[PDB]
Design a protein around this nucleic acid. Structure first.
Ligand SMILES: [Mg+2]
Ligand SMILES: [Zn+2]
Lengths: 1319, 652
DNA sequence: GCCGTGACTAAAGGCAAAAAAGCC
RNA sequence: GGCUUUUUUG
DNA sequence: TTTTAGTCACGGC
């Protein structure tokens, strides 16, 4: 099956594995997040509804008044996205909230309602997500990347024996909440349990534990096992079981029933343990010395004296034994306290506890929280209550509670958002168990411990913070109670919420500036997973652990796409099929494998649940029914990789592209490249510049269509139809009969964007790609944007490349480029620069814009009009004047084009403050857009009138009126005709009513547009008017420009060589680019060679088609060849049949293939060498791929054959003309009198301390004296140096640098006296 | 400083000063009114805190912040730190007469020249042009000269050409790790906007032509120009200061050309013919009557300096090839013919240059280096050496070997299940088996790649060293090594986890054939680790350099001979295996603290206070000296410096 | 009570370049 | 025209 | 965050 939009150029698709899951909408990470933020949720779980319900209702301090939340609605945005970009205003919607203030009677019982007031409050302005998942803030277009932090919960960690010199491991537990203070339990080198809150001072654990109203007896019973002693005749015995004797030593001969059971002295034996188990004897005789190491459990006192005999956690001796025996206490309770099994960490902590009253414990907690303050009981109680057990100051949220219950092996995943008694008890018990061998520690890098915080969650958090601030304000206002004097509008101020939301969206570490220099960069930036930002790591504190790649990144996070330099592995990019779980964790598709048969039921598996199952490999051969052809297959179980059986498999990958991201999936032959070179290739492909004319990639991957469509650069038809009118700036689609709604059928109109400045000063331009009267369907591209060819990504060109050394002009990485490339303007790009001149109101008279400029000739003002604003289309150059600005004194302050760049003014946008006289250029511009609006409205009215009159004619003709008479009648008289049919008469009357309402509607719309456009503007205070100028520079390639490939083989053009010097093959066709072969072996990027060999084969097919069309051969011979090429391959997935194509369709397809038949190659399922050889043999090219060239300059054959083929070249955004810089004498700084820095300020190169050391390593002292004194900052020594040079002399004066005197004053500005001395 | 608008740009210091003066005024007014001591003490404490913040903010505790909620800059913080005055405006400062640009490659330049764009040159040398322009009367006032220069007349170009005759410029690349990162050159006026750089210096600069940028400075006074010419110019810097090894070693493109030129073939066009001399060998190769490398007999006149520094002619018939005979036409007089008779890989060619520096001085050495570069580029272009997908020969036994290796682990997995083998020893056995299999595959691949079959003149099959392109780049030393060629044809081998554990299953697929999703995923563990280490090692290393420069910045040679017999005993280092360093290198270029005693009693082999050079070192080797005592800087008794003799010899 | 030990606090952690913002 | 935060090149 | 060193308070026989 094939639709008409792709029948133009079918891409020959290699690849054997059938695809099951189509690539999802690439922006669904963004769109599906913010959608939850501003959608109505009756359950009150997501976004604004839950944010309001989390704070409201409001109760007064006296309890006599309250505020109720009802609902909310979002208004219509004042300006559209295009208007917002033009006018420099935020695209946002107003938030209207319905509040209800009800006051309770003071003398009446609770629940007595006095008054009910319902009103709407303008609570603030919420920025909106554009259709492309991007935000418009201030005329710009920002993207909020998704953070990757640690999920709230409990995490068990170990220090790996690195802190202490003895190498012992120090386990610990952390309790991370979603909001509130932290909590840590940790051990010490002496095996003492400790607790620390908010990383503050270390405290003994039980201090906090006894803060929960615990008695020491209860603590010991809860944290230990009781051992019972009964005082029998002459001895005291215990009941004994084998399980309490494992891994112990017999202090005495363990024997009972008069028979020896265990030996004396040596360690215990398992056989005697089994003998005790089978005998089932409990009570055993006990000596005296065996009790000397035990610790009493509960308090025991005398009932006669009433004094304390033995206390909890106290060592006991024979004296206490006799004291308890004489008191009649037959029952004695001790602790298990076995070194191997039940470590005695609680007992020793109870030993080191300073007190046991819990009041001194609370006082100590209060002291640790904040030092230097009286320990009032009420303050300490309030602090302890509000530190963990207050919902206002502490919250675990749903994900935190889920992780908390899962990590402790509980059963439910729902509970309170705060801690409790049982939570802390379980955490301590689990940490003790971990210290006691049982259990394992967690891994921080695991993707089961880190979740995705999208834009919706961030906005919800910021909105909640603002709402809490407003809550505090309204509470302090309601504290002053009153009798219905206030109206619930002055109590709520939108300023705090608006400021918080605005600052989050505008100035933040994650609301980054979108880089739109091609669709791929936009897609990659939108689908990014940043680990930095608030509540995250930093570029300096991150070590080698988070930066490294984990086995669970398989399918969720791309391994080979991460920026190099200071943050590598922190800004990794999301994978292709990976989506976000319900709680925020990542998850990937997997095809369930049943009874050895692979099905097509996709299950989304998260990180942790990947461990339990056994997952097969993506590229495993199968039959037609899913049976594995091999009884042994490759699988991964727990981050491992080993051979399993065909019955032990449980899941299978959907496709081979599942592991890589988008940018890495656009690279052909990725599996033949080293990982570093693939990384560099993806990063540089993200930097490509849109050329003048886009050209398809001969060797691709098939993701080009997805990347082009998903990014908002191609105009995609909403409904199918036929192109009624096609133009360079608009497309009109008459919707097909099946797709009209019951009312208001109408048509569709798409308005393209022509030569609009991008964020990187590039050019965004859209061109129609459909012909007049051509059918279209939904989802089909109607106008390709920048770097797109017929709805297909195309970032660079394809050049005939040769791998050979050529006289040293391609020495290390340089490239040699023929002049035929420059002549054809293949790599010519367009850049658009914006200049802004702002009229302010300064002192000594305001600044004016006029053509009266002194000390300038007529040439400098010829390009200017009497208005002073340069004409649109003037070929301005460096140094000229765009806007004539002068400041009264009069001094010339006119805006000028910075030197080094040509220009051609294409647009001038003028913003004039309200109530300010408008200049002539402003009047001309305003007449321009009012005429444009008039034309647009007239066209819409004419289209709607045509539709209405078609309906009118259809109704009247069906009513008995002849068609000829109706046509000969005026259109207005059609509604006035009397119809014998009442139903037809009613229809005509309704049509006339619609006629009148329609004309009223267009009149109102025209009046509204007139009022809107002609009205003034809002902008920064202290500005008279704002004028903007756009300049269009047409860059070409020159020696110094940076070019690259898709496989990381960057380079710099070193020479533009004449066409007569390029090597030429037997047919006389010169090559366009000469590359160095020696860059392939060391770099190990063999992908470029295979791409070259495949492109040579692909162009061979295209040339033959170009030969058939030139000879004007019939369709029958042509159709035969195209079918032969498309049928090539071994077990090719794609099946293209030309039988369904008409003759015109075949001719058009062949017309679109004369530049070379495109080739598709999946990432890890690409074409092998045999397919390339077969494709080459189909053409007229050698199978080896190496042809015999000739030297252009000498005409002599090269001694060896060389590799020639077509390779895809990109022009990176590092142009030499934007980097060349020089300076003799410019402007100097203010304090240090040193030359400025940067190209913009005409600054000089910094001569750093390393260069000073380099000059010191020589014998160079006079050069150093120059660089330090007479070139940098010796004010009295550089004015004379300039005079000497012009005088013909070359001599310096040492002087005294002015950057050292300042230092003296600085040190002299303190109490220190530093001074020089005598001569 | 006033900015655009009603707001004014004020520094962090003004706010602190205003705070302090306001607090002082409040205390002055409050104390004179006999206010209670409750408020007086608090006001005085607040004044103390304000002065503390002004003098040094943040030392005590929470630093006072402005509207930005960021700590303000105090006087103490304005000096301390990387942004402070000392490390930003005193040690290193911005300079005039400087430019920055992208560097490309120019192979037509000489060793002492660089390409300078016309626009950059005209902007840099603006003051010099004004002097000449008014000197010749072409412009009376300075304003007329400035107007004439910007209009870009025709005579201005001639004047600029005149003023760049012998005016060196300092080319610089950041970072400048060593003293060769700043070098003087004589600029050449070229078009474009890129700084053309001589290839041979690229080794010194550590620069590659993939977007690198370099900065150019201009000396002004006569002393600076003479210092540049006499100390900095690249013709004077051909030896490293760290060791005697040169920095003008040809690499990459040149090495491949010189290796292809001097490499014989058993059968070629025009073999066995006898030539008059090297000049004829060039007429045959150009005419196409003889291949570039055919074994011939030629007559060569070589000059040896065996006399007392005098050259003597010598004629003989040598059995060599056309390529070596052609190359002999550029070597200088002193060198013998045995130098250019081998294959001349990367390590040989450098030695050749070294030999010249040992015999003929500096000017013949630099001329020979330039001729080497030109000839190598020319005969590398003429070779047409290319890499193709068919040049990576996969050994045929490889898969078979892999199968056998698999069988081995197929045994152990069974034996581990019978209890005869535990977990750890099974891991060790599998690792050893896979390592042995990888080694065998690598050896088989190398044996297959390094030889080829060719029929000789008589018609019998004879083996010769292969002409495979990838092997020519690997063997000559131009690019790559054995590991890369192994990873392109043989199996990639075992890979390690991020922690360090070796994966049990190795990557059995080379880059020539495909790598599946699982192998490519486990191959990124090493790559990301290496990239992270490289990214985080630049910050640590450079810091170390600073701590090494500031400790030893003030040590300058100030004496000729301190006259002390103290020294350190220098012997060759032995770790229990082969000697890591011979005694010759540890004593070369030093002076003996005392006379060296022969093992025979009372014989003085080396006089005291004598510099040991290569000629003496060879005499030391033939005598088989055991240990030589020499002077060292740490034993010097000179005050506030080190004498010339204790340091030894200037390596540069 | 004096030398040994643990806890509390300060400094330091590339070089050059560009491109954006936003504040003051 | 100073500071800060991001992004990128070597 | 990690490393390192300097300094104040505690400890054991
Ligand atoms: Mg580089
Ligand atoms: Zn000395």
């Amino acid at each position: 099956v094939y639709s008409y939009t792709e029948k133009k150029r079918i891409r020959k698709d290699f690849g054997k594995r059938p695809q099951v899951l189509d690539v999802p909408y690439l922006l669904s990470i963004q769109l599906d997040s913010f959608q939850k933020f501003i959608e109505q949720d009756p359950e009150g779980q997501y976004g604004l509804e839950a944010a309001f319900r989390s704070v409201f209702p409001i109760q007064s301090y006296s309890g006599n008044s309250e505020l109720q939340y009802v609902s909310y609605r979002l208004g219509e945005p004042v300006f559209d996205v295009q208007e917002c970009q033009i006018r420099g205003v935020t695209y946002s919607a107003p938030l209207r909230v319905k509040l209800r203030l009800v006051i309770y009677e003071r003398e009446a019982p609770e629940g007595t309602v006095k008054d009910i007031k319902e009103q709407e409050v303008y609570m603030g302005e919420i920025p909106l997500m554009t259709d492309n998942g991007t935000f418009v803030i201030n005329g710009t277009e920002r993207v909020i990347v998704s953070q990757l932090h640690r999920s709230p919960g409990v995490f068990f960690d170990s220090d790996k024996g690195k802190t202490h010199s003895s190498g012992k491991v120090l386990y610990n537990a952390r309790i991370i909440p979603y909001r509130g203070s932290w909590l840590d339990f940790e051990f010490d080198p002496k095996d003492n349990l400790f607790v620390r809150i908010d990383r503050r001072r270390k405290l003994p654990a039980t201090i906090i534990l006894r803060a929960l109203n615990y008695t020491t007896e209860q603590i010991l019973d809860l944290f230990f096992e009781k051992v019972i002693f009964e005082i029998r005749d002459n001895k005291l015995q215990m009941e004994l079981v084998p399980e309490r004797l494992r891994g112990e030593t017999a202090s005495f001969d363990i024997e009972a029933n008069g028979k020896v059971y265990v030996e004396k002295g040596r360690r215990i034996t398992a056989r005697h343990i089994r003998q005790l188990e089978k005998d089932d004897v409990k009570l055993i005789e006990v000596p005296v010395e065996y009790i000397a190491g035990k610790v009493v459990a509960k308090d025991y006192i005398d009932e006669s004296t009433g004094e304390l005999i033995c206390a909890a956690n106290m060592e006991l001796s024979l004296d206490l034994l006799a004291k308890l025996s004489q008191s009649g206490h037959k029952r004695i309770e001790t602790l298990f306290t076995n070194d191997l099994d039940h470590g005695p960490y609680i007992s020793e902590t109870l030993r080191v506890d300073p007190t046991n009253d819990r009041l001194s414990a609370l006082v100590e907690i209060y002291r640790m929280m904040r030092p230097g303050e009286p320990p009032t009981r009420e303050a300490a109680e309030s602090l302890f209550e509000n530190l963990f057990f207050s919902e206002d100051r502490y919250d675990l949220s749903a994900v935190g509670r889920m992780k908390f219950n899962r990590s402790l092996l509980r059963e439910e995943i729902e509970g309170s958002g705060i801690l409790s008694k049982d939570d802390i008890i379980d955490v301590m018990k689990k940490l003790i168990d971990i210290r006691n061998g049982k259990g394992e520690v967690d891994d921080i890098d695991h993707l089961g411990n880190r979740r995705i915080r999208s834009v919706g969650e961030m906005a919800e958090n910021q909105f909640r913070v603002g709402l809490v601030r407003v809550e505090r304000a309204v509470k302090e206002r309601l504290s002053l109670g009153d009798l219905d004097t206030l109206m619930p509008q002055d109590m709520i101020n939108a300023k705090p919420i608006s400021a918080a939301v605005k600052e989050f969206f505008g100035s933040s570490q994650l609301s980054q500036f979108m880089d739109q220099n091609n669709p791929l960069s936009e897609i990659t930036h939108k689908r990014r997973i940043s680990a930095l930002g608030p509540g995250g790591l930093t570029r300096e504190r991150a070590g080698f652990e988070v930066r490294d790649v984990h086995p669970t990144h398989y399918g969720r996070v791309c391994p080979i796409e991460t920026p190099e330099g200071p943050n590598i592995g922190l800004i990794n990019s999301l994978s292709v099929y990976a989506q976000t779980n319900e709680y925020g964790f990542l998850e990937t598709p997997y095809r369930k494998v049943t009874d050895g048969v692979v099905t097509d039921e996709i299950h989304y598996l998260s990180a942790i649940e990947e461990g339990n199952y056994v997952i097969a490999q993506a590229n495993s051969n199968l039959d037609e029914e899913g049976h594995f052809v091999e009884d042994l297959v490759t699988c991964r179980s727990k981050g491992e990789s080993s051979l399993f059986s065909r019955d032990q498999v449980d899941y299978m990958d959907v496709s081979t592209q599942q592991v890589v991201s988008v940018g890495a999936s656009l690279i052909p032959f990725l599996e033949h490249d080293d990982a570093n070179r693939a990384l560099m290739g993806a990063n540089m492909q993200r930097q490509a510049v849109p050329t003048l004319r886009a050209d398809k990639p001969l060797v691709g991957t098939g993701m080009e269509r997805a990347v082009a469509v998903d990014s908002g650069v191609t105009a995609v038809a909403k409904r199918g139809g036929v192109v009624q009118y096609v133009d360079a700036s608009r497309i009109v689609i008459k919707v097909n009969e099946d797709e009209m709604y019951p009312g208001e059928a109408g048509i569709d109109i798409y308005n393209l964007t022509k030569y609009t400045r991008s964020n990187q000063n590039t050019c965004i331009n859209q061109m129609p790609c459909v012909s007049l009267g051509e059918p279209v369907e939904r989802g089909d591209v109607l106008a390709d944007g920048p770097s797109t060819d017929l709805g297909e990504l195309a970032l660079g060109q394809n050049m005939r490349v040769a791998f050979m050394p050529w006289n040293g002009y391609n020495f290390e990485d340089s490239i040699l480029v023929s002049e035929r490339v420059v002549q054809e303007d293949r790599f010519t790009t367009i850049h658009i620069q914006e200049l802004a001149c702002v009229s302010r109101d300064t002192k000594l008279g305001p600044e004016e814009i006029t053509a009266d400029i002194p000390n300038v000739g007529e040439a400098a003002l010829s390009k200017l009009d009497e208005s002073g604003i340069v004409y649109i289309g003037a070929e301005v150059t460096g140094g000229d004047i765009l806007v004539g600005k002068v400041t009264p004194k009069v001094k010339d302050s006119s805006l000028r084009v910075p030197n080094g760049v040509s220009g051609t003014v294409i647009d001038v946008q003028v913003f004039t403050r309200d109530g300010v006289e408008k200049d002539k250029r402003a009047l001309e511009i305003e007449e321009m857009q009012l005429k444009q609006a008039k034309k647009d409205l007239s066209e819409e009215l004419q289209i709607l009138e045509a539709g209405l009159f078609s309906r009118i004619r259809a109704v009247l003709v069906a009513g008995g009126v002849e068609a000829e008479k109706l046509d000969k009648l005026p259109r207005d008289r059609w509604l006035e005709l009397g119809l014998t049919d009442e139903e037809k008469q009613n229809q005509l009357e309704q049509l006339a009513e619609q006629y009148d309402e329609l004309k009223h509607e267009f009149e109102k719309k025209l009046e509204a547009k007139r009022r809107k456009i002609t009205q003034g503007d809002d902008l920064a205070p202290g500005v008279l008017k704002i004028v903007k100028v756009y300049l269009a520079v047409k860059r070409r390639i020159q020696p110094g420009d940076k070019m690259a490939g898709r496989h990381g083989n960057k380079g710099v053009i070193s020479k533009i060589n004449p066409i007569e010097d390029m090597p030429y093959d037997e047919n006389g066709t010169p090559v366009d680019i000469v590359l160095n072969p020696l860059g392939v072996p060391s770099r190990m990027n063999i992908g470029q060679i295979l791409e070259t060999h495949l492109g040579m084969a692909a162009k061979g097919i295209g040339d033959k088609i170009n030969a058939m069309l030139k000879q004007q051969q019939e369709v029958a011979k042509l159709r035969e060849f195209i079918q032969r090429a498309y049928d090539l391959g071994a077990d090719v997935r794609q099946k293209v049949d030309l039988s369904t194509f008409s003759d015109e369709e075949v001719m058009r397809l062949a017309e679109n293939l004369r530049k070379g038949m495109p080739i598709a190659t999946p990432v890890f399922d690409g074409a092998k060498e045999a397919e390339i050889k077969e494709l080459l043999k189909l053409g007229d090219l050698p199978t080896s791929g190496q042809i015999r060239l000739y030297d252009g300059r000498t005409g002599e054959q090269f001694e060896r054959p060389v590799t020639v083929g077509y390779m895809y070249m990109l022009k990176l955004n590092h142009l030499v003309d934007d980097k060349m810089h020089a300076r003799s004498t410019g402007s100097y700084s203010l304090v240090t009198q040193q030359p400025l820095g940067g190209k913009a300020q005409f600054g000089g190169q910094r001569f750093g301390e390393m260069e000073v050391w380099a000059l010191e390593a020589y014998g160079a002292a006079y050069t150093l004296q120059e660089m330090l004194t007479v070139k940098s900052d010796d004010v009295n020594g550089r004015t004379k140096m300039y005079k000497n040079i012009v005088d013909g002399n070359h001599q310096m004066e040492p002087g005294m640098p002015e950057s050292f005197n300042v230092l003296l004053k600085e040190i002299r500005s303190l109490g220190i006296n530093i001074e020089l001395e005598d001569e | 400083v006033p900015l655009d608008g009603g707001r004014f740009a004020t520094s962090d210091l003004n706010d602190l000063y205003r705070r302090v003066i306001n607090r002082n005024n409040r205390l002055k007014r409050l104390l004179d009114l006999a206010a209670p001591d409750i408020i007086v003490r608090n006001e005085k404490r607040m004044l103390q805190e304000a002065v503390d913040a002004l003098l040094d903010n943040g030392r005590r505790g929470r630093a006072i912040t402005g509207s930005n909620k960021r700590p303000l800059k105090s006087l103490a913080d304005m000096i301390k730190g990387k942004q402070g005055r000392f490390r930003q405006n005193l040690l290193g400062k911005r300079v005039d007469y400087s430019g920055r640009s992208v560097i490309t490659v120019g192979p037509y330049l000489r060793l002492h020249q660089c390409g300078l764009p016309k626009k950059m040159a005209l902007e840099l040398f603006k003051p010099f042009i004004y002097g000449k322009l008014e000197l010749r009367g072409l412009a009376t006032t300075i304003k007329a000269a400035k107007k004439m220069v910007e209009r870009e007349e025709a005579v201005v170009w001639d004047i600029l050409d005149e003023v760049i005759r012998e005016h060196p410029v300092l080319l610089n690349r950041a970072p400048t790790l060593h003293r060769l990162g700043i070098q003087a050159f004589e600029p050449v006026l070229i078009e474009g906007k890129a700084i053309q750089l001589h290839p041979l210096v690229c080794a010194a600069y550590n620069a590659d032509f993939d977007g690198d940028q370099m900065a150019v400075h201009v000396p002004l006074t006569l002393e600076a120009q003479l210092e540049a010419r006499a100390l900095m110019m690249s013709t004077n810097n051909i030896l490293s200061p760290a060791n005697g090894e040169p920095i003008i070693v040809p690499s990459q493109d040149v090495v491949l050309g010189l290796y292809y030129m001097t490499r014989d073939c058993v059968n070629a066009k025009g073999e066995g013919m006898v030539l008059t001399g090297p000049k004829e060998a060039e007429r045959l190769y150009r005419s196409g009557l003889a291949s570039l490398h055919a074994r011939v007999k030629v007559r060569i006149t070589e000059y040896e300096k065996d006399a007392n520094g005098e050259l003597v002619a010598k004629t003989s018939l040598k059995d060599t090839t056309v390529g070596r005979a052609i190359l002999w036409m550029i070597v200088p007089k002193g060198l013998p013919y045995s130098i250019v008779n081998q294959a001349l890989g990367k390590k040989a060619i450098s030695k050749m240059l070294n030999t010249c520096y040992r015999i003929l001085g500096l000017k013949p050495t630099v001329i020979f280096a330039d001729q080497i570069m030109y000839t190598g580029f020319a005969y590398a272009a003429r070779s047409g050496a290319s890499v193709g997908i068919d040049d990576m020969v996969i050994p045929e036994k490889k898969h078979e070997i892999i199968s056998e290796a698999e069988a081995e682990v197929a045994e152990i997995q069974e034996q581990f299940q019978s209890g005869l083998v535990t977990a750890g020893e099974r891991y060790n056995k599998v690792i050893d088996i896979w390592a042995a299999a990888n080694d065998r595959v690598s050896k088989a691949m190398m044996d297959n790649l390094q030889t080829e079959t060719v029929i000789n003149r008589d018609g019998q099959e004879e083996k010769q060293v292969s002409f495979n392109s990838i092997y020519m780049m690997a063997d000559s030393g131009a690019r790559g090594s054995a590991a890369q060629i192994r990873q392109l044809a043989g199996m990639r081998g075992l890979m390690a986890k991020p922690d360090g554990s070796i994966i049990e299953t190795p990557i059995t697929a080379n880059f020539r054939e495909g790598l599946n999703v699982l192998q490519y995923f486990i191959s990124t563990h090493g790559a990301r680790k290496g990239l992270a280490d490289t990214a985080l090692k630049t910050a640590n290393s450079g810091y170390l350099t600073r701590r090494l420069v500031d400790v030893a910045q003030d040590l300058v040679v100030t004496e000729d001979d301190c006259g002390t017999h103290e020294g350190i005993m220098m012997t060759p280092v032995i770790e229990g295996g082969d000697v890591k360093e011979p005694l010759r290198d540890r004593v070369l270029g030093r002076v003996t603290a005392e006379d060296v005693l022969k093992p025979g009693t009372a014989d003085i082999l080396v006089p005291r206070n004598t510099l040991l050079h290569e000629q003496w070192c060879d005499l030391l080797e033939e005598n088989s000296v055991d240990a030589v005592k020499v002077r060292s800087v740490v034993s010097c008794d000179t005050d506030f410096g080190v004498c010339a003799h204790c340091y030894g010899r200037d390596l540069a």
